[PDB]
Each structure stands twice: as structure tokens, then as C-alpha cells.
Design a protein around this ligand. Structure first.
Ligand SMILES: CCCCCCCCCCCCO[C@@H]1O[C@H](CO)[C@@H](O[C@H]2O[C@H](CO)[C@@H](O)[C@H](O)[C@H]2O)[C@H](O)[C@H]1O
Ligand SMILES: CCCCCCCCCCCC
Ligand SMILES: CCCCCCCCCC
Ligand SMILES: CCCCCCCC
Ligand SMILES: CCCCCC
Lengths: 127, 451
């Protein structure tokens, strides 16, 4: 019923970060966990998720870069973010809905984390 | 208002039904998530489980009437039931146990179910005016236990796991037994004839042996639902042939076939309508998030509110016909909600499901609450057995019907699942409308035969 997100932070373009979502009470195993993100001045949008039986869903613009996966021992869900780009900069949320569906809008999910800032800088080393 | 033994029977029945519906509400989800069954397997396995639970009811009535006594068979049934619930909780340690545990629940119900009602019948002198009210309150007891179990058991299983849920089902049975034992003195002059002679240990062993054999047979049939279909088809032809050899029976037969359609639809609440709620309904009502599996509690909920009211307010075939029209409307409402009133993300308001369950529960109050009680007016033990057998066949058929809504575990988009549910529910509602119309057309002839 309450999810804790961890693992945000600051990274340079092309780098990687891992987000994790854990639930205090309810076993997360029964839940589809979707990752949403809100960039400055826009609405929360679906990024990626895994349902209660290992089915996966992805936003087009993150396919081949983000992977959602689940550790059912630790009751934890992960979002592995590789090849990060400046426009992946946002506040990231995990959200949980009972069952096998990953609806696209925030209203499909009852339980929400508090949000973690992910920032991707155009920084690269000097040539 | 009622004799004192009524209150004991009320609470024994409540706690036994609490245990049962604690299992029924979570069983299909348990099959899918815990045992890894596909949704098709879970649905047909639930159909077989429910078929066995209801089909054996004739045996426990025979055991209570003629072998051991009503009060003894209440105690034995309650003990076998509690053992079954605890065996189910243990099945999480030893998964190979699951079918045996479910067979033990099935046989337990078969020993138990007929006997509290039988006992309640004996608490009133035979033309006591309070009888009708007593049975409406008995049904409300069944549905209060079911309401609590269907509300809370999915929450409990989510928060603490299935072993705790099943152990609490067992505990509910234990406290049914404790309430019986504490109130034993209230029914000292109440029972069938064997209750008042010393117990025959010969007959007690015949019943324990037959029970164990039946437990293994049930486990096998639930594991192999294909032969279960075969067995029931053969059994049905044989019973129909015997029935036809032995014009009020023709009316009992036709009302029984209509009841079959009703039980096929009832079988959808724990299977296809449950996963419809999981997959295509908002899990929030009046601002509260809820476990969508708990939506099954809307059935006893509406029964609890509507049974007193509907007790306050034609005759048999028309009441049956009305119930069939209500059931048709429940499934047409489900279909319409999905076809026209869903979100852009594919989700429907849970108020449509509140209404679906209202329609289905009114159908229940018209058909099955008021069925074999008044099939007994056209006939007796044989037809009682036939009713239970046909209702078991109906649950097997219902599981099969539910498989048309099964969703693969990799689907994640509600807009892919919504058209499957709406197609199946709309066709169920249309077929049921046709059945209701044929029922309506036959009401005058049927009502003539009762003359
Ligand atoms: C329509 C039938 C309604 C059933 C009535 C539910 C009985 C009340 C539950 C016990 C007390 C409430 O305890 C809790 O409350 C929160 C918000 O209220 C609910 O919701 C929370 O838990 C459930 C399952 O554990 C999750 O599916 C749900 O998405 C989560 O947000 C649950 O229902 C209940 O776990
Ligand atoms: C009321 C007397 C209690 C009788 C209990 C006897 C149980 C016999 C066990 C037989 C094992 C198959
Ligand atoms: C190897 C798993 C076998 C499980 C059998 C469970 C039997 C328990 C009897 C009470
Ligand atoms: C009133 C006691 C009933 C005894 C039945 C128990 C058989 C195991
Ligand atoms: C009794 C009707 C059975 C239909 C099976 C396909």
C-alpha cells in the first residue's frame, strides 16, 4: 500500500542508473508495477512496467534502453536505465495495481511511491 | 423471536460458510499465481472443485438421516472440513497435497451441507408460523459469513499469504464446532432418529472409509477434469433415464434444466467475472482502494440487503423466469459497460459491477433460493440427488464457459482484454435472454401441469 523508491540521481548522457521499488506491507508479487515519469511542465507518463506474471510493457521511446525486472525473493521491482539521454530527466514514480494489467494512465494505479529525481546531463569529457 | 436452537444453527452455519467462501474467493487467483496454472486450467479446475463440493451433498443428507444422525453428521462434517482447510494451508509446504486437500474440502461439504438446514427444520413445531422467516434468516446467515469471507480473505491472503488465509478458514470451522459443542444442550431433543440411539460403529466405519475413498476420487477428478466431464455426462444420462421411467415430474425436470443455466452463470463470479474485475475495472470505489478479488463480496452483500425486502413482497415458473431475466441483464450490463463505458485506457467504473452483481443476486434469490424447496412440491430423495448432480454438471460446464475469457499471462494491455470479456459476456447475456423468453413462453403450460 506504500511503496518506497530508491536509486535515483545524476548521470551523464549514455550512463546508467537503477531504480528500485519495494512495498512495506502487501506482497508486491500480486501487483503489476508501472514506472511513470514527470518532466518539468508536463503530465506523468507511463515509462515501463511488469505485471504479476512477468509480462512486460514499454513506452516506445525507451525500448532497448530500459529493462523492468523483478526479484520476487526481495519483493522488489527494478528499472534498469541504460544509454540515458538528457530528455530522460524527470521525477520517477513506481505505482502498483493488483493483477496482470499495466494501464497507461496514473488513474489505473492505487498505490504510489513518493518519487525520485533522475537527471541526465549532456556532460561529456573534453576532447 | 425464534426458538433458542435457531441461534446456534444460525452461527454454526455462518462460521462454516465463512470457511468455505474464504477458499472460493481466492481459489482461482491461488491457482494462477501460486501454482502457475494458466487461467484456463484454473477455471476448469475451479469448475471441477465446485462440482464435487455441490454434487456430493446428497450423501451427507443420507448419512445424517439414516446412518449417524443429523447432529453427529454436523460434528463429523465440521471436523473433516476443518481438516481440509488446514490441509490446504499445509499445501504451501507440500504442494503435491493441494488436490487431496481440496477433495477433503469437497467431501466435508458433502457430509455437512444438508444437515444444519435439516436441523433447523426440526426447531419449530411443524406448522409454526415463524418457519419462513427462520429460513430467510438462515440464508442471511449463509450470506453474512460469505460476505465477511469474500471481503477479507483476499486482503488477508495479500497481506499475510495463503497459508494464513486457509488456517483462518480452518479456525472458522473450529469455532463453528465450539459453538455447537457449547450449545449442544439446546438441541438435546432435536435430531433425526439415529441421533437418539447409540452410535453404530459399523456404520461410522462405513462412512469414514467411503469418505476417504471419495477424497481420493475427488482429488483425481480435479486433477483430470476431462474424465470428470466424462463421468458427469454418463451419470446425467443414467439419472435422467431412471427419472423418466419413474405430469409433475416433467415440470420438475424442466425447472431443473433452467436452474442448470443459472448455475452456469453463478460459476462465473469466482472465475471470469473475478478476472474481469482484476483486469478491466477501476480498483477504487467511494475514494477507497480495494482488492478487486473482494468484488465477489457484492453477491452476498446484495443478497443480505435484498432477502428481507424480497421476503416482504406467477408462483413457481414465473418466479424462475424472472430470475433468468435478471441474470441475462447482469451479463448484458457487464458487456455494455465494456463496449461503451470504458476509459481510454480500457477501464470501467466499478459501479457497473455493483449493478452486475445486483442483477445476478436477484436471479439467485428467484431461482436457487426457491428451487429444490419447490421441486419437492412436484415429486423425493431421488430428485434431490438429481438436483445436486445437475448443479455439479452446471459448475463443470461453467468452468468450461469461463475458459473463453482466459487471458495469457504475458498480456498487459486492458484494451486487449476488454473485447474478450465483452464478447463472452454479451453472448452469455443474449443466450440467457433467449432462455428466459422460452421460459416465459412455457409458463402457461408449465403452470397448467401443476394443476
Ligand atoms: C466491494 C467489497 C469491498 C470489500 C471491503 C474491504 C474490507 C476492508 C479491508 C480491511 C480494512 C482495510 O484494509 C485495507 O484498506 C486499503 C484501503 O482501504 C485497501 O487497499 C490496499 O490493500 C489491497 C489488498 O491488500 C490492495 O489490493 C489495494 O490496491 C491496496 O491499496 C484494502 O481493502 C485493505 O487491504
Ligand atoms: C462419540 C464417540 C466417539 C467415537 C470416535 C471413534 C473413532 C474411531 C476411529 C476409527 C479409525 C478408522
Ligand atoms: C514430495 C511432496 C509430497 C507431498 C505429500 C503431502 C502429504 C501430507 C499428508 C498430510
Ligand atoms: C456427538 C459426537 C459425534 C461423534 C462423531 C465423531 C466421529 C469421528
Ligand atoms: C448439457 C449440455 C452440454 C453441452 C456440452 C458442450
Amino acid at each position: 500500500v506504500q511503496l518506497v523508491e530508491s536509486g535515483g540521481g545524476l548521470v551523464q548522457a549514455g550512463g546508467s542508473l537503477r531504480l528500485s521499488c519495494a512495498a512495506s506491507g502487501p506482497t508486491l508479487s500480486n501487483y503489476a508495477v508501472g514506472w511513470f515519469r514527470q518532466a518539468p511542465g508536463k503530465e506523468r507518463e507511463f515509462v515501463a512496467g511488469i505485471n504479476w506474471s512477468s509480462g512486460l510493457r514499454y513506452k516506445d521511446v525507451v525500448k532497448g534502453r530500459f529493462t523492468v525486472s523483478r526479484d520476487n525473493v526481495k519483493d522488489t521491482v527494478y528499472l534498469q536505465m541504460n544509454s540515458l539521454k538528457p530528455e530522460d530527466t524527470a521525477v520517477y514514480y513506481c505505482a502498483a495495481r493488483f493483477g496482470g494489467m499495466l494501464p497507461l494512465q496514473p488513474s489505473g494505479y492505487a498505490n504510489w511511491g513518493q518519487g525520485t529525481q533522475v537527471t541526465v546531463s549532456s556532460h561529456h569529457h573534453h576532447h | 423471536q425464534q426458538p433458542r436452537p435457531f441461534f446456534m444453527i444460525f452461527f454454526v452455519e455462518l462460521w462454516e460458510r465463512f470457511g468455505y467462501y474464504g477458499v472460493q474467493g481466492v481459489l482461482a487467483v491461488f491457482f494462477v499465481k501460486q501454482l502457475g496454472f494458466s487461467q484456463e486450467q484454473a477455471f476448469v479446475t475451479f469448475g471441477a472443485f465446485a462440482a464435487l463440493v455441490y454434487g456430493l451433498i446428497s450423501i451427507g443428507g443420507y448419512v445424517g438421516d439414516h446412518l449417524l444422525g443429523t447432529k453427529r453428521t454436523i460434528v463429523l462434517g465440521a471436523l473433516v472440513l476443518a481438516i481440509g482447510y488446514f490441509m490446504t494451508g499445509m499445501s504451501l509446504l507440500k504442494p503435491d497435497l493441494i488436490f487431496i486437500a481440496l477433495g477433503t474440502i469437497a467431501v466435508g461439504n458433502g457430509l455437512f451441507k444438508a444437515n444444519p438446514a435439516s436441523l433447523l427444520s426440526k426447531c419449530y413445531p411443524p406448522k409454526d408460523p415463524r418457519l419462513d422467516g427462520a429460513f430467510t434468516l438462515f440464508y442471511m446467515s449463509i450470506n453474512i459469513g460469505s460476505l465477511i469471507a469474500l471481503s477479507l480473505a483476499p486482503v488477508i491472503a495479500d497481506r499475510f499469504g495463503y497459508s494464513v488465509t486457509y488456517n483462518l478458514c480452518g479456525a472458522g470451522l473450529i469455532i463453528a464446532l465450539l459453538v455447537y459443542i457449547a450449545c449442544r444442550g439446546m438441541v438435546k431433543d432435536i435430531g433425526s432418529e439415529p441421533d437418539f440411539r447409540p452410535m453404530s460403529f459399523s456404520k461410522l466405519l462405513y462412512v469414514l472409509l467411503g469418505s476417504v475413498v471419495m477424497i481420493f476420487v475427488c482429488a483425481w477428478l480435479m486433477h483430470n477434469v476431462e474424465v470428470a466431464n466424462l463421468v458427469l455426462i454418463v451419470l446425467s444420462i443414467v439419472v435422467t433415464i431412471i427419472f423418466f421411467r419413474q405430469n409433475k415430474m416433467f415440470v420438475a425436470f424442466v425447472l431443473m434444466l433452467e436452474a442448470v443455466v443459472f448455475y452456469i452463470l453463478y460459476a462465473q463470479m469466482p472465475t471470469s467475472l473475478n478476472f474481469f474485475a482484476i483486469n478491466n475495472v477501476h480498483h477504487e470505489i467511494l475514494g477507497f482502494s480495494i482488492n478487486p478479488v473482494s468484488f465477489q463480496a457484492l453477491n452476498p452483500f446484495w443478497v443480505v440487503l435484498a432477502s428481507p425486502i424480497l421476503a416482504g413482497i406467477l408462483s413457481m415458473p414465473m418466479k424462475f423466469t424472472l430470475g433468468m431475466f435478471m441474470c441475462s441483464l447482469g451479463f448484458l450490463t457487464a458487456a455494455a459497460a465494456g463496449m461503451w463505458f470504458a476509459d481510454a485506457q480500457g477501464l470501467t467504473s466499478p459501479w457497473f459491477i455493483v449493478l452486475v452483481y445486483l442483477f445476478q443476486s436477484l436471479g439467485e434469490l428467484f431461482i436457487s433460493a426457491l428451487g429444490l424447496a419447490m421441486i419437492a412440491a412436484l415429486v423425493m430423495g431421488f430428485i434431490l440427488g438429481m438436483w445436486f448432480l445437475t448443479q455439479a454438471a452446471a459448475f463443470l460446464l461453467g468452468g468450461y464457459v469461463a475458459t473463453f475469457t482466459a487471458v495469457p499471462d504475458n498480456i498487459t494491455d486492458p484494451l486487449e482484454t476488454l473485447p474478450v470479456y465483452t464478447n463472452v459476456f454479451g453472448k452469455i447475456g443474449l443466450v440467457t435472454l433467449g432462455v428466459a423468453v422460452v421460459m416465459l413462453l412455457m409458463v402457461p403450460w408449465l403452470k397448467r401441469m401443476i394443476a
